[model samples]
Target chain A: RWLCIWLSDQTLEDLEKMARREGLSKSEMINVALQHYK
Target chain B: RWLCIWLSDQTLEDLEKMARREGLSKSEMINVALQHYK
Candidate 1:
């Protein structure tokens, strides 16, 4: 499945940074964050 | 479409823990995390 979303510039930059830090693809990082959001 | 992957026991446990904490299904959390990857 595929989906699209719009995010603010700051959020986008942060996401990219975090993903790199974790050595994960953008998609993988999102999954990780969502899983841990609590 | 669908895909499956094998994970270590500890990793799977961690994923389940996070998913529960986030109030999201495991699959939903995975999708969210993926979106954030750079």
Candidate 2:
């Protein structure tokens, strides 16, 4: 499923940059972030 | 910005349900969840 969420432009770009830099999909990166969060 | 992330159908639906239950946008819900993760 394609999860569409409205986010601040800066937040979106930050996430995009992180994902690209890590060679991971945005979703996977978010999952990784989630891991670090809890 | 519209952030689109590809997620498994189960994860997507689970997120949708949680967001609705929390009366928050999915993105906000995710942010909240992230706080609990790391």
Candidate 3:
């Protein structure tokens, strides 16, 4: 499923940086973060 | 289920900073990143 949402440039950049640093696909990193929520 | 993962200090710090900058909970930012994966 795909959805569109807006984010600030800083946030998007950080997302990219963090995902890269963790050696995770951005999706993988996001899943990690989401799982933490539950 | 909760999983424990280790993150380097620098990575953790960057995550916090980015999360804060975006005015998002780390988890929320993470979810945003994940959704973008597809």
Candidate 4:
């Protein structure tokens, strides 16, 4: 279990270059963009 | 650039599960989730 925030750093630097050029990282694309934040 | 949260384990558990079932993780996911919380 983990949690963190305060991501005003330009959306965490564009979510780390769009999650590593699309391979996926930035903590797993921020949990897959939170399922459309639904 | 990282704050913490008090998300219930139910969500956390599901997060971890869903992320893995597809491809992702939690901490980064938390940030994406906040965008909607706003």
Most DockQ-accurate candidate: 2
Provide the clashing-pair count of each candidate structure: 12, 6, 0, 2
lDDT of 3 by residue, B1-38 (tens): 12223444443444555567778765555545445433
Q: Rank the candidates by DockQ, best first.
A: 2, 4, 1, 3
lDDT of 2 by residue, B1-38 (tens): 67777666656665666668888677876555444433
Considering chain A alone, report the TM-score of candidate 4 relative to the true chain A: 0.33
**Residue B9 Cα positional deviation in candidate 4, in Å, after optimal superposition:** 1.0
lDDT of 4 at B10: 62
- List each candidate's DockQ score: 0.11, 0.46, 0.07, 0.21
Candidate 3 deviant stretches above 4 angstroms = B1-38
* Model 1, runs deviating above 4 Å: B1-38
Q: Flag clash pairs in model 3.
A: none
TM-score for candidate 2: 0.56
Tens-place lDDT per residue, model 3, A1-38, is: 23233445554565577678878754455445544432
Residues A1-38 of candidate 2 have per-residue lDDT tens digits of 57777756445555655567778677876665544533
What C-alpha lDDT do the candidate models reach, one value each? 0.52, 0.62, 0.50, 0.56
Give the least accurate 10-residue stretch of model 3 chain A, judged by summed lDDT: A1-10
When 3 and 4 are scored with TM-score, the better candidate is 4
Lowest lDDT sum, 10 consecutive residues, model 4 chain B, at B29-38
Top candidate, metric lDDT: 2
- Candidate scoring better on TM-score of 2 and 4: 2
Each candidate's root-mean-square deviation in Å? 7.5, 3.5, 11.2, 9.9
TM-score (all chains, Cα) for each model: 0.46, 0.56, 0.41, 0.41
Give the number of the best model, judged by TM-score. 2
Give the per-residue lDDT digits (tens) of candidate 4, residues B1-38. 76443445666775676557646555455555535421
Interface RMSD of each: 8.5, 3.2, 12.5, 7.3
